Design a protein around this ligand. Structure first.
Ligand code: HEM
Ligand code: HEM
Ligand code: HEM
Ligand code: HEM
Lengths: 147, 140, 146, 141
């Protein structure tokens, strides 16, 4: 949602094919942790998280990073329903984890800030708009069983 | 917010390499905002918001220079931006979400021009800064 | 988020005493005073320039009553707030473009107004019950974004 | 939020009428929060959180005094609250949404006890204040 036009649907996968599904996940989450330091309370099991380079360097963040993109690519596959695709994940994050749904929005913004960091001017405003629709729908899906 | 000394330097350094590109980046950030979050256009009713538009450009520059003056008076922003505050908060009545929207688009804009300097630390510092600016401009 | 049977009872027990001529317009008024950017949706309402002018504004008080009504309406239909607010959702989001955070803001001002009015009797567990209501209302009014 | 002179006068004036009831009001505000928003209880994983609790009621007075202390230094707040900034933001890593919740519960408390002070104007003043307090407690400086 809102919908993603066919051009938006075609511009997004194109870019998403150039992104290293094994390293950029920990890149997004890592900055969520450093940009928004309070989110570090959710990942206390991950050892050292006291400094920027440490958080970026912490291996578990990296490894957990991949699972994130996992879910996001997974959600890219079916814009049909992020709500259903993230039913399991919503319940995990919402009921069992107590993560405030605003942090969902933030990750989807850090992610978008991260895509922009890699791809420079290939990350055009219309490509950004399309991705904003994706990180919105995904953050909304995850926060569905708070509804 | 309340900026750390590390924030204050990182922001001046980061917004130091924008330099002459101020009106370009501010033009980009606005357009990114207007596309990604179309509701924001509601505040610019009679504007020509087209790609490359002369008004978005001129306005882009006005945005960016305010920031340059903000970074300068970072210890005394509420005094420095007091005219802009009455504008955005008393006359224009801009909803605070919109400042989050534009600060994100400036941050995205910087990430896509300054791939070197836009590190986790400086990203965080710029975030705090833009939040602080947003705070001032939403109050009388 | 589903009230308990004793929550549901405390809720309607308190709402039944609520001066429906006043409270709505006091909550909307305080929304306008406490969160002045929300005035932008109400340039049609006249003088909103001082707290007293806002609170005494006949259009504020009048429109406030319609607010309270939809709330009351939601208080009876706690099991389907989605459809109950489906038209207002359509209205506040697509014509009015009100940001969904403001729905949460208003709900919390209504809770503040209630506390102002029923002092001690607006007890902590009563408030909790109301929090679940205004959240649900705000969530329903933002279902459009979903 | 920068707190106008009018705001500063209105907060002092309405926080004065608090006075002796500081612990009482503070205790209740934490209680209102804990019940209204269950998720906030987990920041106190070792606290006794029952009604009347010695920990809750004792903690709430510390909140009320940090606030009395905040009202006393409205113009000099990020330094007056330098300890609490690191406590809540750095060490405890509190999600900023919670400060919105406690400020609200604080407001609802004050509206329950001081129904003549809580004019819409003062309500507004107190809001900008509490949210100013919160901004400092969620800043790393
Ligand atoms: C908004 C997009 C998000 C997506 C797509 C997402 C997706 C996921 C996925 C796929 C997992 C793995 C589940 C498993 O392996 O059992 C997970 C776990 C987790 N998530 Fe995220 N999540 C999001 C938001 C967040 C945010 C914003 C936070 C915290 C600030 C968070 C906190 C956690 C925690 C604490 C875990 C489990 C950690 C562990 O297993 O050690 N999630 N999430
Ligand atoms: C970092 C955030 C912002 C900065 C630094 C900023 C700065 C400025 C500046 C320098 C002007 C020039 C006007 C003058 O000096 O008279 C202006 C005007 C204006 N701003 Fe912004 N602004 C910001 C955020 C926003 C946002 C988020 C919105 C709405 C989405 C907005 C809406 C407007 C409007 C409607 C005008 C007047 C347009 C006109 O000239 O007719 N501002 N702002
Ligand atoms: C939070 C719960 C809310 C409820 C229950 C509610 C309820 C209502 C109702 C019953 C109407 C009357 C519509 C009609 O008669 O067709 C209305 C209209 C309206 N709403 Fe609200 N609303 C809420 C939130 C908000 C907020 C926070 C704002 C602004 C910040 C807002 C802006 C408006 C405006 C401008 C109108 C129409 C006024 C006019 O037509 O002149 N709404 N709403
Ligand atoms: C108006 C807002 C707030 C004020 C004035 C405030 C002030 C204080 C004060 C004075 C203390 C006493 C520290 C000590 O002497 O040990 C404290 C501790 C603490 N605060 Fe608050 N705080 C606020 C908001 C919050 C919120 C919203 C939360 C979480 C929901 C929170 C979490 C904590 C925790 C977990 C402690 C230490 C408890 C322990 O010993 O485990 N603070 N704060």
């Amino acid at each position: 949602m809102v919908h993603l036009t066919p051009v938006e649907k075609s511009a997004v996968t194109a870019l998403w094919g150039k992104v290293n599904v094994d390293e950029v996940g920990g890149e997004a989450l890592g900055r969520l942790l450093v940009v928004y330091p309070w989110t570090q309370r959710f990942f206390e099991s991950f050892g050292d998280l006291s400094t920027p380079d440490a958080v970026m360097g912490n291996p578990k963040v990296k490894a957990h990073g991949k699972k994130v993109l996992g879910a996001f690519s997974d959600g890219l596959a079916h814009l049909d329903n992020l709500k259903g695709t993230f039913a399991t994940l919503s319940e995990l994050h919402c009921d069992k984890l107590h993560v405030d749904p605003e942090n969902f929005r933030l990750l989807g913004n850090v992610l978008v800030c991260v895509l922009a960091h890699h791809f420079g001017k290939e990350f055009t405003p219309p490509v950004q708009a399309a991705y904003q629709k994706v990180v919105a729908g995904v953050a909304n899906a995850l926060a569905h069983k708070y509804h | 917010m309340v900026l750390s000394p590390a924030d204050k330097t990182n922001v001046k350094a980061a917004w130091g390499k924008v330099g002459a590109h101020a009106g370009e980046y501010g033009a980009e950030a606005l357009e990114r905002m207007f596309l990604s979050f179309p509701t924001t256009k509601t505040y610019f009713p009679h504007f020509d918001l087209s790609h490359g538009s002369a008004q978005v450009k001129g306005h882009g520059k006005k945005v960016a220079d305010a920031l340059t003056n903000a970074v300068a008076h970072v210890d005394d922003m509420p005094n420095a931006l007091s005219a802009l505050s009455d504008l955005h908060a008393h006359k224009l009545r801009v909803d605070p979400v919109n400042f989050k929207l534009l600060s994100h688009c400036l941050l995205v804009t910087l990430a896509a021009h300054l791939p070197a300097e836009f590190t986790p630390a400086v990203h965080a510092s710029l975030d705090k800064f833009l939040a602080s600016v947003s705070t001032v401009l939403t109050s009388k």
